[PDB]
Structures are given as structure tokens and as C-alpha cells.
From a paper:
The genus Enterovirus within the Picornaviridae, a family of non-enveloped viruses with a positive single-stranded RNA genome, is comprised of more than 100 serotypes. Most of the uncoating receptors bind to the “canyon” sites of the viral particle, dislodging the “pocket factor” in VP1 and subsequently triggering conformational changes of the intact particle to release the genome, albeit that SCARB2 binds EV71 outside the canyon.
Here we report the structural characterizations of E30 E-particle, A-particle and mature virion, among which E-particle and mature virion are compact with fully ordered epitopes, showing the potential to be ideal vaccine candidates. We separated out two distinct types of particles by ultracentrifugation and characterized them using SDS-PAGE, single-stranded RNA detection and analytical ultracentrifugation as either 143S F-particles, containing RNA and a full complement of proteins VP1–VP4, or 80S E-particles containing VP0, VP1, and VP3. The three types of particles reveal a pseudo T = 3 symmetry arrangement and the overall structures of three particles resemble those of other EVs. Like other EVs, E30 contains the canyon-like depression and the hydrophobic pocket in VP1 harboring a pocket factor beneath the depression. However, compared with EV-As and EV-Cs, which have a continuous circular canyon around each five-fold mesa, in EV-Bs, there are, instead, five distinct ~15-Å deep depressions. A ridge between each depression is formed by the C-termini of VP1 and VP3. A number of key structural elements contributing to the canyon, including the VP1 BC loop (the north wall of the canyon), the VP2 EF loop (back part of the south wall) and significantly shortened VP1 GH loop (front part of the south wall) adopt different conformations and move toward the front, together with the ridges, ablating the back portion of the canyon.
Author numbering:
A (entry chain C), B (entry chain C): 1 to 238
C (entry chain A), D (entry chain A): 9 to 284
E (entry chain B), F (entry chain B): 11 to 261
G (entry chain D), H (entry chain D): 2 to 13, 24 to 68
Write the structure that this text describes.
Amino acid sequence: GLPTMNTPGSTQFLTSDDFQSPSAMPQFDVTPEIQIPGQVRNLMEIAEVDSVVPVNNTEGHVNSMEAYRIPVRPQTSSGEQVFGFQLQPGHDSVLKHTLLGEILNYYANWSGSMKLTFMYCGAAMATGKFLIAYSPPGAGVPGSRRDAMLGTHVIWDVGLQSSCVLCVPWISQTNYRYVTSDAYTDAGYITCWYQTSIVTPPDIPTTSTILCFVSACNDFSVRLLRDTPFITQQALFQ
Amino acid sequence: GLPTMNTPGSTQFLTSDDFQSPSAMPQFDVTPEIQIPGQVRNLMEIAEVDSVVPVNNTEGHVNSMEAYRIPVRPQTSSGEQVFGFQLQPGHDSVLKHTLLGEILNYYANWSGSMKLTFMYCGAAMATGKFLIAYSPPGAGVPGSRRDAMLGTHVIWDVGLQSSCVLCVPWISQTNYRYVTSDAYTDAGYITCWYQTSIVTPPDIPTTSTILCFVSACNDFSVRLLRDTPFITQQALFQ
Amino acid sequence: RAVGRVADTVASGPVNTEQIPALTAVETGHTSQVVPSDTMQTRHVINYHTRSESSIENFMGRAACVYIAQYATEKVNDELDRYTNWEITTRQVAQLRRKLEMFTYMRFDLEITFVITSSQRTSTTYASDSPPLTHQVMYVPPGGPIPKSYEDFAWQTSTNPSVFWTEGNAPPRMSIPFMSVGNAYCNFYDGWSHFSQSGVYGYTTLNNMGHLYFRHVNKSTAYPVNSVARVYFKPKHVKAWVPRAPRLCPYLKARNVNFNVQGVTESRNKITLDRS
Amino acid sequence: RAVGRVADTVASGPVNTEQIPALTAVETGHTSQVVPSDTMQTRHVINYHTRSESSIENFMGRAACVYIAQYATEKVNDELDRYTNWEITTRQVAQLRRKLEMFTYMRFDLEITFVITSSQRTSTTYASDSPPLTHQVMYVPPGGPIPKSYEDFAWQTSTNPSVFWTEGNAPPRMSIPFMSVGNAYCNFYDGWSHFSQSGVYGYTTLNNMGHLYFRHVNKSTAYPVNSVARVYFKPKHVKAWVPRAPRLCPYLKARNVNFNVQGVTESRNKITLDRS
Amino acid sequence: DRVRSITLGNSTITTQECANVVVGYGVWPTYLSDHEATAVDQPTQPDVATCRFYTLESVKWESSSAGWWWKFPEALSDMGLFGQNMQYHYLGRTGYTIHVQCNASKFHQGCLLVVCVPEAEMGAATTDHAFNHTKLSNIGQAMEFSAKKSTDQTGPQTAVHNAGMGVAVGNLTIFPHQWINLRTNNSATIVMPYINSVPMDNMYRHYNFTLMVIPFAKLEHSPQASTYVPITVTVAPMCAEYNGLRLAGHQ
Amino acid sequence: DRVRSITLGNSTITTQECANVVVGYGVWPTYLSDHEATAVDQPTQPDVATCRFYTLESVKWESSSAGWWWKFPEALSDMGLFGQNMQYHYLGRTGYTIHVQCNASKFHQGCLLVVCVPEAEMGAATTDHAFNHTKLSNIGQAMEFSAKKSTDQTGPQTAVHNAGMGVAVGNLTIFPHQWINLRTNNSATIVMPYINSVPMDNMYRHYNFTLMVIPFAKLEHSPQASTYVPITVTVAPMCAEYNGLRLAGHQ
Amino acid sequence: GAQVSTQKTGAHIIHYTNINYYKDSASNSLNRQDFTQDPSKFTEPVKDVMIKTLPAL
Amino acid sequence: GAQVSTQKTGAHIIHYTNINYYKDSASNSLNRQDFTQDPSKFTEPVKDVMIKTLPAL
Ligand SMILES: CCCCCCCCCCCCC/C=C/[C@H](O)[C@H](N)CO
Ligand SMILES: CCCCCCCCCCCCC/C=C/[C@H](O)[C@H](N)CO
């Protein structure tokens, strides 16, 4: 026949191969596809949708809807902290079971900017200002509102538009950060502070609620598929 | 030689393969083919031929020609039922040994409309009207001629043309039903009722005979070849 | 519209006509060509279904086991001899026989594939070390010298087609052309072999395809080894004529169409349906 | 710019405008399209990153083990019988099940690969000499005759697709087309099998894919040998619709979506950060 | 229409209630072509002395009649010069015009399937036993089915619902067929071409096709009507030719 | 703007504080095309007697309310001629205009997620046990979630933070949704197309989508304000068509 | 001598190449893609044509 | 019937050849190089268009 020679790698099963193989059902007439709405061609279409973040996840609050409810109230003095978490969108406990966080745990590398949206769910007669800040990871955590005003931040005025977007920019020295966290690719901190206060008229409840949403920007990308460390089994499901 | 590499699936016998293989008789002179009449290029040419249905198959009647003879007679009141069976052309006992039913048991999926032809084999002096109805499978079996007049039906006037065709349409939510029956792909019911009566002159026998024929329409198709559950053997035939 | 694609149904409205497509005559031998558009109101459906799986080449072109041949490296009797044979036929297994007997005359090329497997015979000891076994499947055309034993001269296969195969590799496979002395293979023959209407009745007189002899070409083993060779026929380039009725009754023999009398279908208790 | 490449960010300077890109309304169901160029001063970055790994074909196109089938050359009971079977499903393993259940309806072709391995059963002796084992993996479509035992006629596989494989070679592999009677595979079915809203609730009524029967085609061994066959599904030519929320809770059964109630995420001690 | 006239040789068939003509597999009988022949000697073609109508004996149709079969060309072994040409020749080849006729009344009822089955190879009644050829078919006698099974030690299995072939009798409507429904139909005519896997054949050791006549709806009438209805079969060869002239056979 | 008027049939919805309209997956409902149909019979399309607004019963929103769900088309099984056409037909196909409405005040506070989940297949509260269909959804009754887990022996798992599906409730914002924030929003309207893997389906054995209404920020107000706020759901079918006329079902 | 033909695909990179290796046509693969048919030999084998709308007798 | 396509390379001898061997399109390899997407079915599925700079209400 044609003189051939076998290279290393013959008669192996590499599970991420791409080879042709013969059909067990030859000339099988496949049914025609129709227009079903909501077709997905990329997992980055899923990750660019808002998903509400459980910032209030101090247990026991994770076993109820109290995990999503960031509480605010009128203050006695200004500049106190509302919440704060590390910006680890695949490793931090606040962000790793969100809809953006669950896609990133299938991957080992992530890159791009993110959008933190906030939503004031108090009464329409209550006003307020807030400062939401992002800190690059070099100096440590901000300790006050003076420490937080030096980084990327936005002052949000609660009014007729109930929502504000803090855009977390990609400020990194590498083109990719790791999903499981390490010290080389640390991304920094997100904190929120009282810019002024909550000022209400009489006959209004004290504590209000803020909802935090996460999504990816249009320069977001993922890399290096892996298994997720979220689902486990000790035996086959019968 | 030419550097090669072996993919998974080398040195296997997949019985539905399609590969070339060398000849044991090289340059064998095959005898010339001639025109033999009745050439078959498709099993759907066989399934589109009428084949008389054993509707009267209540044993002991299957061991005689009484299985094909649907009996009718003059009635005391009208609107009674003549016969009825489920429309399972590969699983129902009435239709699975007919000529259309035997081809479908080689396959797992079927699709298309069917033709039920009826043939009045009584005397030429006897008249009669009949209602033959098809019911989609949602509500259950029709309980009367009032229940059967709401679905797809035809009123047959017995006259000089002895035959009528009830066309069973393909009213399904899937493009294919299963040959072995299940509840997801149920196809419905076929029933027949006295529209009026059998009216005869004197000196004529009471009981007459109706023959039912099944065939496939020109939009009929089958899919997913399998072994038929009709022939068995415990040893090799010696 | 492509070849092999089923027909669309056309949109039909209400009718009040002197035309009668529903009324016909079965007595004419004619199967009525009634469409659902003729007896009820339909919509326009573009049917994309195809009759691919129902072709004679696709219905027949799957390999089916036709014989299980047994032979050993040590003779017990002449059924477990050193060698064995098989008269080539398609009637010993029931799955392929029922598929071929849906037609009266066929004309096809063949693919024969062997799945040969060995097993160590039951003994008081098995601890040995044997070289890999090699088998021979010699075809003998009708009228040739057959092996009368092991160590025979007829296994020299100077003009008979042979194949050799060591255990461990891919299964052996060769192609066979259309081999009948007529113009088609006869699945059925309603007649006799002698002109006086005597001798052998049936299709057995039209099946002279020869024998297929099996052996181990290894001379000996330390402990005896039983082999089994399965023969797989896949028909290709298939033509077929005069479609038969499918068989109701199971088979009894390989050289006959003899049967036991059975009912036409399975039963039920009454002829109606009785719910709401 | 090529298809699949992410967007560049544009250079933005200071603003004092009546435009408010930061302020929006979540109540509209709308995800805001805010770029970092809108809320801060940026530079011009030419981003060359690509969304290659995140495609539905690349996310799904890796082979995952879906079943572990066990069978022996000598029966212990009907769980370690001569033969075994498996109803074809994707829900017994958890890694592939969580990936498929991110979508409601899918439509793909398959690659099935078997990693069959044998092992000698624990005995008082092992010193034997056996020929190489050959296995059969016969697919039975829904409603066909199943093997009721070893030595069965149904293993003649005249119309069922079979594969044969001797130990030592490359793993066997075949391709499967899209097999649903609908227009997509349903990962979820919110309904029942009977019209009276009773019977079986869930996706089990929409999964009629048939069985997969395994055996040793060798007749016997000197000492019994246990085999294990791993089934690997790789979906190719994948379409997907209606993206689902990922599952929080682990699975309990294969025919249900039943779960135990768990918290939405893992906890921490307080809602702030407290260093400098 | 219902009228039809078939003229072959010096014989004519007239019918006033004809259903139609079924022509084989859509093929009219004809002589063998030059690019399909095997034998080299010149054939003989007696055009009108052989391709004429030959009527057989009638069979009495009763209520308890299961059916009858005729095997061809052995059914016409003694019918004139068609039978004399079979004896003197090794090979022969012909198509047929089968005409089955049965009239009763407008006060009778019944239905007969009339099939022409090519290679209707029949099983044995008592198995593990070969049967005699005179039980399969005599020279012109109608061999008849039975309502129950046969225990003949040297005969075919004549249970009619299995049709002697181990198949369902309802599935015989793929072979070229008509129906004689007494309500509407008087006769039934089938034109068969030559069906074989060889271009010519021996007309003694081979039954090329079998004509079956089977009551699906049985004959019933008033006792004061005519209690005797016969079923006559009239068969005409078509384009019959022969080869291999030697002495008179047929052993 | 905040004003919107939706007119379908003989019914009109007016809203003075509208957020927007969410349209499905970007698809407007329409009738089935000829190149996608499977059934061959002519469909029936009652354009205004079925594609009109049908309002359900209000549910009382409290501080300790976990949420409610409705399963469709079984939620409108008795709503006029939409319910009469489900009983008489085997197949049906429709898209919807869901309109949820809840006003409180400028002195109340709360927020409701309004999701439309296609194939919201629910698990069982007590596992290794199949549940009853009347616990999944009654005919128009609002089936309601719970704050803690359910130990019902024949019911779904109604813990709201798992949403009955074993997922995180925060991730439901990929399904077509709006929010009713009482600070700014009065109502919420979602237009759903037909989502299925088959072109038509049976409207009894299959819940095509489930409408969930979940308080993310709970209702709280002064005790001297109105302590009763209801939540009304008004649903209009869109481009509804049917096939397979037979007797009235639905077993 | 390469025959490029159309692959079996569905309905709503689609071609394959074949080289013949052997000198006998019986050595070739199966003719899978031949779907021609004409069922009028069996379903309507009558001498005079029978139009559907007209009466059969 | 050879389809020469572009290989997956980085950014700052780049082609591969493919022959189809089988007669079924389900026998083909994976479509790795198809990166088309449109996320507006999910992120912005509202009826009236919402410009970023303008107020949402
Ligand atoms: C060791 C080399 C083995 C070579 C094998 C050659 C054997 C094949 C030659 C004869 C082929 C006969 C094909 C059989 C056809 C059936 O009998 C017909 N369907 C019935 O007439
Ligand atoms: C011995 C030869 C073995 C041949 C193997 C054939 C088995 C494959 C045929 C059925 C393929 C079913 C594919 C399954 C799809 C999933 O169930 C869907 N994601 C859920 O509906």
C-alpha cells in the first residue's frame, strides 16, 4: 500500500480532540429546525446580564431573601461604611454564585471591565447620597471615606432615577487575572460609604434597602476551560 | 513513509459502516441483468398498498377468516357503535400485522397521514349510512355518536360505489410519532357508528360484512431502523 | 423538490361538488390516491421529510450475523474437530431471512466480515504461554476438492480464495460480487429439481454457493482452545423485485418454508371502545 | 474588526454635561450598556482579546463520561451478569448535567467513545493463558427486541447498529445525528405524560433514546474477568436556546430535579471591610 | 365503464359488469428481446393455436368454502396445443390473461379475493416430511384450502388464513389482484406478464405463479334463492414461445 | 415616557407610571408559518374573543410575603372562550401580554421581581415522592412560595430563595423580567412569545411558562398608612390558534 | 478521479470526497444517496386510468 | 473538495486543509471557529430604545 509511519500519539483518546468518525445511523433524516426565540451562541451573552448580588450574606441570612438586602438608615454622623467586598468575581463569596460568577468558574482566566449597578428600594419621599469606590490593590483596604475618595469612585444622588452604575475598570498589569484568587493577580476592593445621609419626612420606616447587580462589560473575555468546583457527586445518580 | 496518526475508532467493526474492501473474486464477470417486472426501490412503495385489517380479532376469531369480517345488521335504534381501535399503526393489535404495520416495526419513528378504506360486502339490495370518525387524543375515547361528530369524520352512503375512504390526517405536535407506543406521542382513536341503519327488502340475510383496508398516504415517512419484535429464534435453523 | 422528499399538502377550503374523491371501488385492484386535502379543510404545510431510511440499500445495508462456526485446536469429535465447514446460506438466522424474504428476486454484492474469538477449554490446568493464534477461512466453489481432514493438501489454496488472520487485529473483510448463474438471486422457487416433479421441493435447488472452511493454522497448543467465528453478511448495490408478504409464522427449518399454523394477529376482548 | 473580538475603549476626557449615563433604571428590565469611557477618563486601548473559548461549540465540545457499565465473563448475580444495559441519558453524572442544564432546548450531534477495561476477579488462583477479549456494544432503538440473556438471538444485530472491539487497540467511536422527534432536545419539561395531569412529571417523558447493551462475545474464560465500559458523550454542531439559571443545589436523583434547600452563597462574618 | 370484450385467437370473452383490468406490475406481456436471450436456436411462436382462451372446470362456492388454488403453467398441461408444446420443448415463456367469473344475484352476498402470487412456495402440513407433487397441483384440478389446519402426511398446509405460505392472508394485496364483490362485480380479469429470474424456463419442474381465489366475506343468501353458484376460471396464454425441441417429455 | 395604553379586543389597560415594555427575547408573537407547521388540518383563530385581557384575583402583599407563582396556560383554563378552546382542541399555540399591577404610595417601600420562566420544572418538597398536580397549580389560584423550606408530602419545594428549581433566586434575571419598585414604578408589562421545542402543543399536560412575583425588598410602611396593598395580574393571549378539534376534554 | 458529492444534511463544508481504490466495482461502498421511487406498479396497476374525482364505476 | 481555512493564531503556514470523508454531515468535526454573537436578546430586550445618555424615565 501507501508506505506510512505512525507518529507518537497514535491510538489515544484525548478528550478535547477534533476528528471525524463514522455514523451509526447512515442517511438519518434529521427533523427540521424552527425559529425558537432566545438562541445562545456565546456564554458572554449570558454573563452580560445583570444579576443581583448577595452582599448581605452574613449567616444566618443566606437561607432567606435577607442576603440580597443591603440595609441603610438615617445616620447620626456621616461618612460611615455601607458595605465592602473584595473584587474576586469567581472566588469571593459575594460574587461567585452570581450569574457572572458561575460562568467564570468554568474558566481559569478572566479579563475586562465590570458593571456594579445599585438600586435604592426605599420610599419615594426619602433622599440620599452615596459614594461607591473601587480601589486598586496596592495600598490595602480603604479605611475611611477619605481613603476611598482617592481611587475610582462615583457619587450617586438618589432621585427619580433609582439606579446608578459604578463601572469597575480593568486596571491590571497582566492581560488576564485568575478566577481562583492569588496574590499576583489581585484586583482590589469595592466599598460604599455615606456621602451625606438618608433624610426622610415623618411617618416613614427607618431602614431602607439597596440592591446590588453585577454584569460584564463589552470588553469582557474568559479563557482556559476547566471543571467547576461547585458540583460534586460520590456515586452515579440512580 | 507518510507520517500518520490513528484516531479513536481504529480496528473496530461498526455494523452500519460504509467502507471499501478488496474482492475475493477479481475480474469476475457478473451475468447481465434483465427487465424483471415489479422492481422495488423503496419500502414506502410497499406500505402505500391497501391491506385488509383484522378488526374482528377477538379470539377465537384470529384462527379463521372471521378476523377480517366486521359484522353489521339492521338495528332497533340508531347511533350504536360498529367497531373501534386505537390509532397505533405499529403497536395496536389490529394494525401491527398488516402490511403497513409490518414495515413500521422495522423502524422506530413514523410520520404522515393514513387511509382507512371500507368495503361493504353485503347484498346489492341492502342500503345503509355510516359515520367513521377520527379523534385527536386529548379528551379520551368518544362515548357516543354525538361525541364522535366533533372530530374528523366522514359520513359514508352505501350505494353503487361500494367503498369509502376515511383519511386520517397527521395532527401532531411533533414531526414524528413512535412506533412502539407511549403517552407523549399518542395518536388518537378510530371509531365507526351507525349513521342510520341497514334497511333490506325481504328474503335477505340479516348480518352483512364490512372489510377495512389500511395504507399510507404520499406524505408518509419512516425513520430510525431497528430489529423487529416479531421474529425470534432460540437456536440456528438446521 | 428534491428526489426522495415527501409531498406538501395544499390549502383546501369548503366544497359542495359533484366530485366524489372519498367514494371508490376496492374491487378494481386500485389503491385510492386520496390526500387529506380532498376530504377536509387543510392548511399549506411545507413538508421537508425524506424517505432516506426506507431505501432498499439503506434497509438492507447493515451487517447481520449469518452463522456461528465452531472448531478447536484439539478434536473432541467431528463437531468439535480441528476444522469445520459451512454451506453458504442466508436461512439459518431469522433476522436476515425475514428481511430478504420480503422480495422474490434480488441482486446484490456482498461484504463478508468475520468476528473470530477464542476461549480456553475447561481443564484441570490453564497455566501456559502460547503464541498468537492464526486462522484460515478458505472458500471452496461448488465442485472443488474439500478438506477431508487437518494437514490436508486442499488447504494449499493455490486457486481457491483464502484469508489469514492473527488474533488481536481488525476483523477480516472481503467483497463478493453477484454470483448467481441466473439474472437474480431467487429467494423463492416454487418447483422441483427433477423434471418428473420429484426430488427436492423449494429454494434449495437454486442455492449452489459453495462451502466455507475454517481452521487454526497453528499446529498445536499446550492446552486445547475452542474458537468461534461469526459470519456477517452486508448486501450492497441491491436491486429487488416482486415484493412478498411478510412472514407471520416463525421458521422451523433452514431448507424449507414449513411452518406451524398461527392466528393472523394477537387478540382483544371486544371489537369496540367503551369510555368517554 | 474580526468576529468574536472584544471592543476597544476610546479616549475620553473631562465632562460637564446634562447627559447622565451612570443614572438608569433597573425596573425597565434593561441592562445598562455603560463603558468605562462614560464614567471616567480613559486612554485608547487596542484590545485584541477574543471570545473563542466561550462559544457554545467550544464550551460543550469536550468529551465527558456519562456512564460506567459493568459486566463479567461469569455471572455472580444479575448486576454482575454476563451482559448489562443502560438506558441512554445525560443525567446520571453531574458535570455534564450541569453544563447542559444551562439551556432549555438544545440540538446537537453526538460522538460516543467507549473506554473499556477489564480486570481479573479475586480468586484463589490466576495463572492462566487467555486469548484477547472482544466486546459488543449493541444499540437498541426504542421498542426493539432486547437481549433477555446471554446466547440470545437478539445479538445477531441484523438491523440494530453494533460495534465490536478487541482489547489492546484504539477506543471505539461513532457519530450520532440529532435524534429527537421534536425540533430540539428538551433539557426541561414542565408537565406530565398523561392528559389528566398525572403519571410522570418532568423531563423523563421526553427521553426515549433507547438502550445500550454490553457483553463479552468470547464464550468463556479460565478464571472470571470483570469488565468496565465508560461512555463518553461529546456534543458537536450545537445550537442552544433560552439560557437557564445555573443550579445551586446538588442533584439527588436522575429522573427528577429534586433538591435539598441550601443557602444562596457561602457566608462571612460582617458586611464591611475593616483595615487601612 | 362496466363492459369489456377480450378477443384472443378464435375465442371471445364478454362481460357486462367489469370492474377494470389489472395489468401485472404495469407490464404487458411480450416476446423475449435479442439482448436478453440465452438460448441460440430459433424459437417457435404459435400465435393463435396457443394464445387463446382455455376454460377450466367450475368449483361450487358454498358458505363453508375456504378457497381454491391453481398452479401454472401446470394447470394447462393438457389444454390443446399449449399442452403439446410443453411436452416437446425444454424451455418456454409466456404471460397470461386470467379471467375469473362468478355471477349470483342482487339477493346474494359475498366477496372473493383473486390473487396471482409469483413463486407461491408452500409449506408442508406434516413437517419434517416432503410432500407429493400431486397434492400441490393436479393437471387441471382446483386444489382447495381448508378452514382449519391440515394433518396430511404428504400434503401442503391448507389453512387458508396462513395462505399456505406462513404469511397473513390479509397481506396478499401486494400481488396483482382484484376482488369479486357480488354486490357490484361480476368477473375479475388479471393480465400477468412473465415473471422469473431467468428469461426462459422449464414448464414442468417449476410453477411460475399460483392463482388463489379466497372468500373473504362468505357466501350467504336466503334458502329460497339459487343454492348453487359456480366459479369458472378462463385463462389465455399471451406471447407464448418455446425452445429446445426434442422428444415428448416430461421426465 | 411613563404613560402607555394597551388595547386588545374589547379591553384596554391604561398606566400612568410605566417603566417600559419588555418584549420576550426580542420577538413579537405571531401565527405559525407554513414552513414550520406539522399538523395538516386548518387551524382556528378567534382573534378578539380569545386575544383579550383576562384579570385574575388579587393577592394581599404583606411584610412576611415570600412570593407567588402562576403556571400558564393552565392559569386561564376557565377564562372565557380561551378556556373553551382548550377543551375542544388537541393542540394550541399562543404568546402572552402579562401585566402585573400594584400601587401603594410615596410613603411605602418595596420591590417585586416579575419573571417569566419557560419550563419552570419544580422539585418536590418531600423527596423520593411524586407530587399532585393541584399543588403545582390550581386553575387560577396563586400558588405561593414560603420563607422557609416545605415539608409537604405531595407538594413542591416552595422555599423562595431556591425558587423551587434548585437555583439561586438572584439569577432569575436572564428570563424576561421587570421590577416593580414602589418608589418609581406602578406596573410591569412583559410580552412573551411562544417558546417551545415543538410548533404546537397540548395545553393541559404542559405548563409552557411560569410567572413568578417575588418581593426582593419587603413591604414596609408606617402603621397609619394603608395596611392593604393588592397585586393584580392581567394576562392577554396573543395570536392564539388551535388544532385538532374533537370532544371536550381533558383526560 | 475524485468524485465530490453532496453530504446528507438537514433542512431549515457540506461535501465529501471519494476515491475508488480497487479495480472491481463490487469493491465499492454502498449507494446510500439514491432515493428514486415510483409506486404506481403496485398501488394503481390498472389498464384504464382512474381519476380521483370521477366515479370509479 | 478540499476546504483550506485559516488557522487559529495569535496577534501582535497559517492555513489548514480539510477533506470530508463520510457521506453524513453528522460525521463531520466540530465547528470550532464560529464566534458570532448578539447579546441584545437578553441585555436590552425592551420595546422602546433606551439611549445611554438620556434619562431612562
Ligand atoms: C477465506 C475467504 C472467504 C471468501 C468468501 C467467499 C464466499 C462468498 C461466495 C458466495 C456468495 C453467496 C452470496 C449468497 C446469496 C444468497 O444465497 C441469496 N440471497 C439467495 O440466493
Ligand atoms: C454498539 C453501537 C452503539 C451506537 C450508539 C447509539 C446510541 C445513541 C443514540 C441515541 C442518542 C441520544 C442522544 C442524547 C441526547 C440527550 O438525551 C438530550 N440532551 C436530552 O434530551
